[PDB]
């Protein structure tokens, strides 16, 4: 939880890191989205790419991003510590992120967080000894109408009950990758028990278009 770095045998400037040749190709595409002379705009996506390859960001990975884009390391350090999606210490294979802001809290996100801890045997902020799961609370994830919900890696699992999230975790242990989305019966954000709108077939091209076009 600290915002100062101390060298350790497993995280120091001589920790091995380097982009793969395939990932170097992606960096060029990233760097070409921004005007020439403003390459520093690529720090966030390139730093995120380093995390996608390595799972997290050692100080060596940050130094490499600074080196490639030719920005001071401090400016990369500032970015890595500002945004909460960058992992500056190793996390588990499955980073379980439970939303606990008020809209999800109102719909009993507490029972979800409790169920995960009881099943995994860990506490919030901890990693399992087998290093398969890391559990943390997070702020609103932009899926409030589908609360309570969690994000595991890149996927949202929504409309959860303690039963739903235990099956999801059991699938992850089994190696199966569960499908994201609501587990209650609806497919997305539509009201449960049937659409109250958008039930009629949609109008086609040119419907209601004003005169002059």
């Amino acid at each position: 939880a600290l915002f100062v770095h101390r060298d350790t045998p497993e995280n120091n400037p001589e920790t091995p890191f380097d982009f793969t040749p395939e990932n170097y190709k992606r960096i060029e595409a990233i760097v070409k989205n921004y005007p020439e002379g403003h390459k520093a705009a690529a720090v966030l996506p390139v730093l995120d790419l380093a995390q996608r390859q390595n799972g997290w960001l050692p100080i060596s990975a940050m130094n490499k991003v600074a080196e490639i884009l030719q920005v001071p390391p401090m400016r990369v350090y500032e970015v890595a510590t500002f945004y909460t999606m960058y992992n500056r210490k190793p996390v588990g294979k499955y980073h379980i992120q439970v939303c606990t802001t008020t809209p999800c809290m109102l719909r009993n996100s507490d029972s979800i967080l409790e169920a995960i801890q009881k099943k995994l045997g860990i506490k919030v902020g901890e990693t399992t000894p087998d290093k398969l799961f890391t559990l943390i609370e997070v702020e609103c994830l932009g899926a409030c109408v589908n609360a309570p919900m969690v994000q595991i890696n890149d996927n949202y699992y929504e409309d959860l009950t303690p039963k739903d999230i235990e099956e999801i975790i059991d699938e992850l242990k089994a190696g199966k990758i569960p499908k994201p989305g609501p587990r209650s019966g609806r497919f997305s954000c539509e009201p449960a028990g049937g659409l109250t709108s958008l039930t009629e077939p949609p109008k086609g091209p040119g419907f209601g278009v004003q005169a002059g076009l």
Partner: protein
């Protein structure tokens, strides 16, 4: 009109809101997207800004500025720098998930909106900034953008109009403050998401120090339709100065939490009951509502009986429309704790740049945590009110205001609850 609501499907813009039709280009084209886009582009920026102005459209990101006037700031002769449209898809306000559905279910509405909107401003490219947690939505958008490029709808000679336009998706890395328009720009430039002071204004010095307009996903995604069906058609919905339709998120204590599109100025009670299945336990089980996302002050049940969901009506109720994120709390809710959790949210999201919010929001969080337990004295309530007024209006960005308003709403409408909790704690610890 006197009564607003009961919007008909023909008049809905986001006709694939629930993803039950194809979201890719073929589906979007069959639903009326990308239609006569070339004709709209050849009418020129002044004509486009005319339709947006006539429509009475106002920013859907929360602040609600009149869009037509705001976008016209860019309609000025070039000085040498490129001009950019930045589309705000950060979507960070708790209770707000409306922009998420547009990006993944109606991505081509957003892409066309960027092209049409970007034409009005004379922009060369649009940067769509999407929050990093919306990974699958960003990929859906990226697929949709490839289709438009492959069809010649964007890029060189966009739609055959002779206008060159690019659409870039840049992902965030987890920060609610990066939804603030200038902090968004700072993030695109690769710095910490810290807002800039104004002036300069983005239309003069913006992303990469170039003229820029930041526009919300919903605001941009409706511009193609307004230009096709006319500003007069859009302006025919809602009250005067509160025109159009609006996406509503209803969450909290309702039977059927959902995202729905409804006319502006729809009564709040009708919205919760017609679409969200009503308040859990019945309308009489209602305690309070947060009408426009966590930043807007809460209103109690009595105010909710007749309040309309538009900009002017909710300002009369001492709150705001905000993002139209309706968070419902019933009588079983611990209101003080619910608001306390929101202050804890703002404490975690403050960028730390400026003193009143870096120090004050953290200060408000510690006081609220004691108010939850009643571990306080009544004199501290007016202290907390005064602390909030020292933050509001004194910060660089509106996050400081957004942290102080929820506190004021609690004190304004639930002061007796705060005092009962303090009175009860003293007895148990006397």
């Amino acid at each position: 009109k006197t009564s607003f609501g009961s919007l008909k499907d023909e008049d809905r813009i986001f006709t694939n809101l629930y993803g039950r039709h194809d979201w890719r280009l073929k589906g979007a084209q069959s639903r009326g997207d990308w239609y006569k886009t070339k004709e709209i582009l050849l009418k020129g920026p002044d004509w486009i800004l005319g339709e947006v102005k006539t429509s009475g459209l106002r920013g859907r990101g929360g602040a609600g500025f009149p869009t037509g006037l705001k976008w016209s700031f860019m309609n000025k002769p070039s000085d040498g720098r490129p001009k950019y449209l930045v589309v705000n898809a950060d979507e960070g306000e708790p209770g707000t998930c409306k922009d998420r559905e547009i990006i993944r279910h109606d991505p081509h509405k957003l892409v066309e909106g960027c092209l049409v909107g970007g034409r009005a401003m004379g922009a060369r490219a649009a940067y769509i900034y999407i929050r990093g947690e919306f990974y699958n939505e960003a990929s859906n958008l990226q697929v949709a953008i490839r289709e438009a490029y492959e069809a010649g709808l964007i890029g060189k000679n966009a739609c055959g109009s002779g206008y060159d336009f690019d659409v870039f998706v840049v992902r965030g890395a987890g920060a609610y403050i990066c939804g603030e328009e200038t902090a968004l720009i700072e993030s695109i430039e690769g710095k910490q998401g810290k807002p800039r002071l104004k002036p300069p204004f983005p239309a003069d010095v913006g992303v990469f120090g170039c003229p820029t307009t930041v526009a919300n996903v919903e605001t941009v995604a409706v511009s193609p339709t307004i230009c096709r069906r006319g500003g007069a058609w859009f302006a025919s919905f809602g009250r005067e100065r509160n025109s159009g339709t609006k996406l509503f998120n209803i969450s909290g204590h309702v039977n059927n939490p959902c995202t729905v599109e409804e006319e502006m100025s729809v009564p709040l009670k009708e919205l919760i009951e017609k679409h969200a299945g009503g308040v859990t336990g019945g309308w009489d089980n209602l305690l309070a509502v947060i009408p426009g996302g966590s930043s807007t002050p809460l209103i109690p049940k009595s105010v909710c009986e007749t309040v309309l969901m538009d900009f002017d009506a909710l300002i009369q109720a001492q709150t705001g429309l905000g993002t139209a994120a309706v968070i419902v709390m019933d009588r079983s809710t611990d209101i003080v704790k619910a608001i306390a959790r929101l202050i804890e949210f703002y404490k975690h999201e403050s960028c730390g740049q400026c003193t009143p919010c870096r120090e004050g929001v953290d200060w408000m969080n510690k006081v609220m945590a004691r108010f939850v337990r009643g571990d306080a004295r009544p004199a501290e309530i007016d202290s907390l009110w005064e602390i909030s007024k020292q933050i509001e209006g004194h910060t660089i960005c509106a996050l400081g205001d957004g942290a102080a308003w929820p506190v004021q709403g609690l004190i304004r409408h639930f002061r007796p609850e705060l005092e009962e909790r303090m009175q009860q704690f003293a007895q148990q610890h006397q």
